[PDB]
Amino acid sequence: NLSKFCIDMTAMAREGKIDPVIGREEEIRRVIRILSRRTKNNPVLIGEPGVGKTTIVEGLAQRIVNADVPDNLAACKLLSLDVGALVAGSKYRGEFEERMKGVLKEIQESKETIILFVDEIHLLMGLKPMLARGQLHCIGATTLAEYRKYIEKDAAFERRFQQVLVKEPSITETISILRGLKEKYEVHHGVNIADAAIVAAANLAARYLTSRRLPDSAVDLIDEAAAAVRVARESQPEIIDSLERRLRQLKIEIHALSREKDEASKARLAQAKQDAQNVEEELRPLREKYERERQRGKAIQEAKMKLEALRVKAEDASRMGDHSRAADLQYYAIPEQEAIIKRLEAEKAAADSMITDVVGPDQINEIVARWTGIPVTRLKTSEKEKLLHMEQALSKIVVGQKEAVQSVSNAIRLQRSGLSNPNQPPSFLFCGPSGTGKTLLTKALAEFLFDDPKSMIRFDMSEYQERHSLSRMIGAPPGYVGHDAGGQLTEALRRRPFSILLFDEVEKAAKEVLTVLLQLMDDGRITDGQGRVVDAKNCIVVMTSNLGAEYLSRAIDPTTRELVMNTLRNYFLPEFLNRISSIVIFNRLTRREIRKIVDLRIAEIQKRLTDNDRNVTIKVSDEAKDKLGAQGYSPVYGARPLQRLLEKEVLNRLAILILRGQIREGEVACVELVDGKVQVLPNHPD
Amino acid sequence: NLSKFCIDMTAMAREGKIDPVIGREEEIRRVIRILSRRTKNNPVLIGEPGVGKTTIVEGLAQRIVNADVPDNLAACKLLSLDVGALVAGSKYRGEFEERMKGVLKEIQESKETIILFVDEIHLLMGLKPMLARGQLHCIGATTLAEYRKYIEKDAAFERRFQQVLVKEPSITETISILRGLKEKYEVHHGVNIADAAIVAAANLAARYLTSRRLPDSAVDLIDEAAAAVRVARESQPEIIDSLERRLRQLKIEIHALSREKDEASKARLAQAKQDAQNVEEELRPLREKYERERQRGKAIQEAKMKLEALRVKAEDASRMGDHSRAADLQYYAIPEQEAIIKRLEAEKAAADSMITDVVGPDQINEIVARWTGIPVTRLKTSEKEKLLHMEQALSKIVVGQKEAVQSVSNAIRLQRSGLSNPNQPPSFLFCGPSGTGKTLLTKALAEFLFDDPKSMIRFDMSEYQERHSLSRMIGAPPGYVGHDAGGQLTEALRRRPFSILLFDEVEKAAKEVLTVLLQLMDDGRITDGQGRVVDAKNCIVVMTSNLGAEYLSRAIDPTTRELVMNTLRNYFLPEFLNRISSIVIFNRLTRREIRKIVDLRIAEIQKRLTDNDRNVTIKVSDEAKDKLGAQGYSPVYGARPLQRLLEKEVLNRLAILILRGQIREGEVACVELVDGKVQVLPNHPD
Amino acid sequence: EKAAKEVLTVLLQLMDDGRITDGQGRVVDAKNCIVVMTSNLGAEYLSRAIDPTTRELVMNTLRNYFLPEFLNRISSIVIFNRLTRREIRKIVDLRIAEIQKR
Amino acid sequence: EERMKGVLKEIQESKETIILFVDEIHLLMGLKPMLARGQLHCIGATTLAEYRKYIEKDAAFERRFQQVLVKEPSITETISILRGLKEKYEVHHGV
């Protein structure tokens, strides 16, 4: 028989080597209905890669072999066969097609109803399975795109098929499947785990390592964690290996002195004999407890092995009816094995590097850290304390609208508390003069709430005032030219959902993209031109304005607030306008805060000084700062100009004397001013 | 002889593995006489996808095999080539090219005359049918879109053909064809079906499903419901299975306990044998009647099967002319098979309960439900009970304008009553204050008549004050600015046959807008600017206004209403105003309805608290309710901002304390107005 | 000044990435590199006597051409002018020096 | 193919857990050793280019491997490893 390429699922099912599936049953029954459906028997599943749609097929087969299934299909069997393996048969398609017809017939001339799951089904593209008229069955599963690319472009084949979707499970579903496979994996490493670590780890992978999808992601996370900790238990303790290297060098010394004959040699001979003694009679306690734990875990492993083997054999026999041996094996070998395990556990509990075989969340934390280099500190923060401190925290970054800060704070608070629409994320639309750090405000926001620069994006609506600009920016359905670039916005949502959304020049926008953004607000997602309606619940969305700022006199009054109220209600649909978290405003910039910013400026300057060993002592006279500020305020950009202004107007002469070294190590940057012109004074000429 | 890629449809007919389709038989005669022509007898069908135009082609073939033929086409052979798999599966067009060649020439090897069906002939473009008009026939079918974009371009190839069209099936067609398919699917399934179930099914299938096309949509959903009923029928009852599982446990326990020396084991073992006999004498009656009804359905299936077998054998002999032996079969098996059928129905009805072969509409209703996310609880009124509870149900949504909603309900009753002008759906003029749930009322009607928000689209007359707005709303020819996006209302109606048409604040829409939408509404229809066919007599249209608020004095009297309507008729065409089925009057919202409104809002709050485990109770004190109403009362807009007012007032500090924990789960959010500025009275200190 | 503003965008990235993301996504560091870009609009204001008043005219002349922060993510603005007849003759002397060298 | 199986077979003929690192693994892609998970053991290594060219095509391998890049070493590290080398290199040429 040419079962060469085939793999009998039902075999391992009876064998029980297949992993125990969990959850997602209604889908299974849907599959069933599709099978017994006459017109198009074809279950053709679709989902994102890696999710182990495979796992789902196998779980259905598992449910099958228990015979609690469609009767007309209970007598049927399932098996896999890699299409790549079939085309691995030969090099050329011609001789290959002989193998293929062999496949189609070999199953055809099979007097027992058995079905094949054609994984990666689309690869039929590269046909013969027009033989499908009920005499046979298949099972389809592959990604959406290529399905639309080839299957959707074949009527006859497809009018005989029925797309099946795959929802991506959520946190709780992880919790389920992970708690399930916990025992299996712990055995395969002979280890222990606690739950809260699993919970966190799941959430964490969900948050940051997101180039892949739930849930197998957090699974392999568990994997690597357990591997690392199992490597540590498998490895000798640091005291043990140091002891052993020591004693090796100790017997080295002992005998090297046994060669020489002089009183010092014999002295350190006896001394190194005592050394090797001490170390050996100390290690053999620790050495032997290490060995004992090795043996304990060993016995544990093999006991679980025979335990589950008996379990699967007994389940098989019960499915058969071999009652006598089934019952005796069950109520004899299971209980004694339980006793074995419980006395093993008792002795391990009494055993008190002695590492806790149980893993810890901190472990996963370190792992994800080296996965993304992100400071471990920020991770172990539950996203709650930061909330109870974010307000003043970000105040410590920029100042100027305490009220705006605390407002957006309350907004995100009400989001995370879950006291609103749980699907439409909070939305933001600013107004006021640039220079404050509005951008920078959002920036600190992100790197505090997602802890990443790239978490920010940028959108400037002059670039988005043509309807076709909208088209390209959201991408177009594959039937259009936008198929080669797609939607940068959309694709950004894809790659990193937990991120931030900037929008600017919104006054200069096209009305249509304005409306699709309004939808996004009320949608919490966007129906792409392709069908992948990608969530936004992990997003933050900001729009910019500076128009009414012409009202801003240095001074907060409600009067001007209503001024710009109308000044905006005119601009956009008041219903649309009802979709901000709350109206976001600004104000003028009194001198005091500006010179405070100057203090922050000289601060980051001293920071740059600290970046290297160079001690430099910035002495900004009060009046220095005073002139700096009083000069560089921009009625159009505030200190954004003044920033680089002072940057130049110090860094120049600073680096001058630095290159010159005339102001030497440990010296003082006496930041001086000369008659209305700032001039730091060199401690010396050449 | 590479017919391998093609199937002899005529054979399949003589094989009798096809389903006799009905309807469009005049189209059959059309294409028949076309093939009788010598001018250009190779037509193309104008066909919308998903109509099973296939089914048409096969009906053609079936009539063809049975003397329903112009003698010129005596023994022509309709065959079926999978053109798609043929063209796209070729990795290199050369093999594709030689395939095309070979099939072409071998067609000319017409040992008998054949006429192959082919589709998507544009896919043959991307000119090798060099002699199609000679030595060749063409069975074409597609939408007019492809005919235009590819065929209407070329001259010779196109002019070789003729145009024929088939339309969307009416209800009645589906009715008949489903009545046909009833028996076929039954015989494939061995279950029962209710006529009216099918009727209401296909009805809702038209109501919804516009994605897919009738009829075959109704067919497939019927099939799915059927298989669901079949899966339940295939399964043994869950109570029996559970009992038998318990019984297997009991057998194992018996084998385990009999080998034990203890009167505990012996007593429970006697108990186990006893209850084994119990559950056996329990299930085996029900188990055997399950087996029996299964044998009944099996007799049914095989009886109908041999019925069809002998009947088509007799039909074959008829086509042979064996009237002697054909009539012998007809009068020796057919009515006797029917008598077998009658006896089977008799014994099955006499069995009458856990499993029913019939298909309650509820089942397919659940199917379409999880196809739409709406309970059939909604999908059972035919708008009748939707009316007979309209007043009350809508009141449960919004209140305060009992007169206005009353008139709305009356005129909508008239619309449903089929006696008012069905061409011109009743139209309405909201007129009163603002922020009164006005747009909320619009959406309320929208859903209450559809139970879905997508059936309502925003169209404010404020953007539509001019004839430029006219051109953008009504669409335009290719040469005007209101055309590129189609027309807003044009496309809006192009999608929906059932929706409401929002005309907000129409005192902005100029008289010209009144007159053009009069052209529209007077039959609920006009011709779009883009140049298509559009009619929405099933849709709904409603206008709004608020200039009557200015009349309204803080407490509707016709006195003020009189002058209001005067100002309207002299501001807006009184003849056009006569198209308004009812002027929707409103008054000053007194404080009681607003109190109840805020109560509904805090209800939305408490229920979103329920939306998670985090759920405490609000206690809005009377004075708090009243004061907050007085505050958020916006005489400019009723209390439209009062909602944001209230939420920002309480919900902020609420969540603050919550995520701090000053009040824990389930307890009271005692909203007690302190100093007129209520504070969320905490319960747990620091 | 004639550039496609999206090429300008990728250049601005280069200015602010230290590297660049490509069609392969991969990134290659340019920290050890520098960049040059020129214009010749100011010739309008070119009339020898260095005066500030013109420089702001030029600054706005190019503000309207690019993004503000783009013109700020720069390291420094560059300015040129015509040549003094004396330095003209000087560079000619350099030329004849080149000549005698050849 | 057959010699490849022979050694592949020869793998199965193993006293202890035989591990066969392989480089250029793309060379076998541009599937044969899809036989036994658990029996065979290699380490992957190539250019990121080759990663996307052949690693990311067969979904089987995609579930069967995990990548670890190699950051470019730095200068001080060069100095160190070069001291290491320097020892043996001079030993090779006594200067």
- CB-closest option in A49, A84, A120 to D31: A84
The answer to whether the Cα torsion of B110, B113, B117, B121 is positive or negative is: positive
Whether chains A and C touch (3+ CB pairs under 8 A) is answered by: yes
Nearest in space to B628 (alpha carbons), one of B554, B679, B555, B678: B678
Smallest Cα distance from A165 to chain D, Å = 19
The CATH number, out of the four listed (3.40.50.300, 3.40.50.12500, 3.40.50.10800, 3.20.20.140), of the domain defined by the range B378-585: 3.40.50.300
Chain C contact partners (≥3 CB pairs within 8 A): A, D
CA distances from B467 to A570, A673, B471, B668 (A): 20, 66, 6, 57
Rounded to whole angstroms, the Cα distance separating A525 from A539 reads 10
Smallest Cα distance from C47 to chain A, Å = 27
Overall residue count recorded for chain B in this entry: 686
The answer for residues whose C-beta is within 8 angstroms of residue A296's C-beta and 6 or more apart is: A344, A347, A348, A351
Rounded to whole angstroms, the Cα distance separating A567 from A434 reads 18
Which chain C residues touch A648 with a CB distance below 8 Å? 76
| 3 state DSSP class of A429 | strand
Nearest in space to A587 (alpha carbons), one of A623, A551, A628: A551
Which chain A residues touch D67 with a CB distance below 8 Å? none
Question: What is the pairing mode between strands B668-672 and B679-680?
Answer: antiparallel
Provide the angle, in degrees to the nearest 10, between the axes of the packed helices A361-372 and A195-207: 20
Q: Which residue of A has its CA nearest to B615?
A: A419
Rounded to whole angstroms, the Cα distance separating B286 from A384 reads 59
- Which residues make beta-bridge pairs with A46? A142
- Discontinuities after residues in chain A (C–N over 2.5 A): 126, 352, 555
Chain D contact partners (≥3 CB pairs within 8 A): A, C
Structure tokens at B321: 């002319």
Answer for the pair C30, C18: CB distance below 8 angstroms, yes or no: yes
Place of tokens 């009046």: A623
CA distances from B401 to A295, B398, B582 (A): 82, 8, 14
Answer for the pair A7, A79: CB distance below 8 angstroms, yes or no: yes
Answer for the pair A324, B255: CB distance below 8 angstroms, yes or no: yes
Specify the resolution in Å.
5.1
Alpha helix (H) residue ranges in A373-433 = 376-379, 385-395, 402-417
- Which residues make beta-bridge pairs with A79? A116
Nearest in space to D25 (alpha carbons), one of D39, D9, D12, D42: D42
Residues of D with CB under 8 A from a CB of A: 31-32, 34, 58-60, 62-63, 66
Cα-Cα-Cα-Cα dihedral of A343, A348, A349, A353, to 10°?
180
Rounded to whole angstroms, the Cα distance separating A39 from A134 reads 9
In this structure, what are the phi and psi dihedrals at residue B460, rounded to the nearest 5 degrees? Answer: -85, 135
- CB-closest option in D34, D62, D66 to A85: D34
**Omega before residue A215 within 30° of 0, cis:** yes
Question: What is the pairing mode between strands B617-620 and B668-672?
Answer: parallel
What kind and span of H or E run contains A598?
A: helix A591-611
- Solved using: cryo-EM
- Which residues make beta-bridge pairs with B44? B140, B163
Structure tokens at A68: 């609690």
What angle (nearest 5°) sits at the alpha carbon of residue B321, between those of residues B320 and B323?
Answer: 130
Smallest Cα distance from C92 to chain A, Å = 34
Other C-beta atoms lying within 10 Å of the C-beta of residue A212: 14
Which chain A residues touch B439 with a CB distance below 8 Å? 575
What kind and span of H or E run contains B582?
A: strand B580-585
Q: Which residue of B has its CA nearest to A319?
A: B248
User: In A295-437, which ranges are E strands?
Assistant: 427-429
Eight-state DSSP code of residue B494: H
The answer for residues whose C-beta is within 8 angstroms of residue B267's C-beta and 6 or more apart is: none
Residues of A with CB under 8 A from a CB of C: 637, 640, 644, 648
Answer for the pair B406, B556: CB distance below 8 angstroms, yes or no: no
Gyration radius of chain D's alpha carbons: 19
Domain B591-680 has CATH 2.10.260.10: no
Structure tokens at B420: 């008012």
Smallest Cα distance from A496 to chain D, Å = 21
Which chain C residues touch A504 with a CB distance below 8 Å? none
| 3 state DSSP class of B619 | strand
Chain B contact partners (≥3 CB pairs within 8 A): A
Which chain D residues touch C26 with a CB distance below 8 Å? 48
Which chain D residues touch A220 with a CB distance below 8 Å? 66
Answer for the pair B650, B673: CB distance below 8 angstroms, yes or no: no
Alpha helix (H) residue ranges in chain D = 2-12, 48-50, 59-64, 75-93
Nearest in space to B121 (alpha carbons), one of B140, B94, B104: B140
Other C-beta atoms lying within 10 Å of the C-beta of residue A445: 23
In this structure, what are the phi and psi dihedrals at residue A534, rounded to the nearest 5 degrees? Answer: -90, 130
| 3 state DSSP class of B535 | strand
Answer for the pair B327, B387: CB distance below 8 angstroms, yes or no: no
Gyration radius of chain C's alpha carbons: 19
Smallest Cα distance from D38 to chain A, Å = 13
Q: Which residue of C has its CA nearest to D51?
A: C24
Alpha helix (H) residue ranges in A109-170 = 144-146, 155-158
Rounded to whole angstroms, the Cα distance separating A37 from B645 reads 56
Contact check, Cβ <8 Å, B644/A68: no
Q: Report the Cα B73 to chain-centroid distance in Å.
A: 42
Rounded to whole angstroms, the Cα distance separating A408 from A431 reads 14
Which chain A residues touch B143 with a CB distance below 8 Å? none
Answer for the pair B682, B662: CB distance below 8 angstroms, yes or no: yes
Contact check, Cβ <8 Å, A50/D34: no
Eight-state DSSP code of residue D28: G
Answer for the pair A223, A185: CB distance below 8 angstroms, yes or no: yes
Answer for the pair D30, D5: CB distance below 8 angstroms, yes or no: no
Which chain A residues touch D31 with a CB distance below 8 Å? 84-85, 88
Which one of A440, A457, A462, A644 makes the best mutation probe of the C interface by having the most chain C beta carbons within 10 Å? A644
Cα-Cα-Cα-Cα dihedral of A655, A658, A660, A663, to 10°?
130
Is residue C23 exposed (0-12), middle (13-18) or buried (19+ Cβ within 10 Å)? exposed
Contact check, Cβ <8 Å, A88/D63: no
Structure tokens at A265: 């040699």
List the A42-46 sheet strands across, edge first: A6-7, A77-81, A114-119, A138-142, A42-46, A161-164
Residues of A with CB under 8 A from a CB of D: 49-50, 82, 84-85, 88, 120, 220
Fold of the A6-165 domain: Rossmann fold (3.40.50)
- CB-closest option in D31, D59, D62 to A88: D31
Q: Which residue of A has its CA nearest to B601?
A: A420
- CB-closest option in A49, A50, A88 to D32: A88
Rounded to whole angstroms, the Cα distance separating A310 from A304 reads 10
C with D: how many residue pairs have Cβ under 8 Å apart? 3
Exposure letters B252-261 (e unless 16+ CB within 10 A, then b): bbbbbbeeee
Answer for the pair A676, A624: CB distance below 8 angstroms, yes or no: no
Q: Which residue of D has its CA nearest to A6?
A: D35
Contact check, Cβ <8 Å, A50/D63: yes
Contact check, Cβ <8 Å, A644/C68: no
Which chain B residues touch A126 with a CB distance below 8 Å? 89, 91
Eight-state DSSP code of residue D67: -
- The one-letter amino acid code at D91 reads V
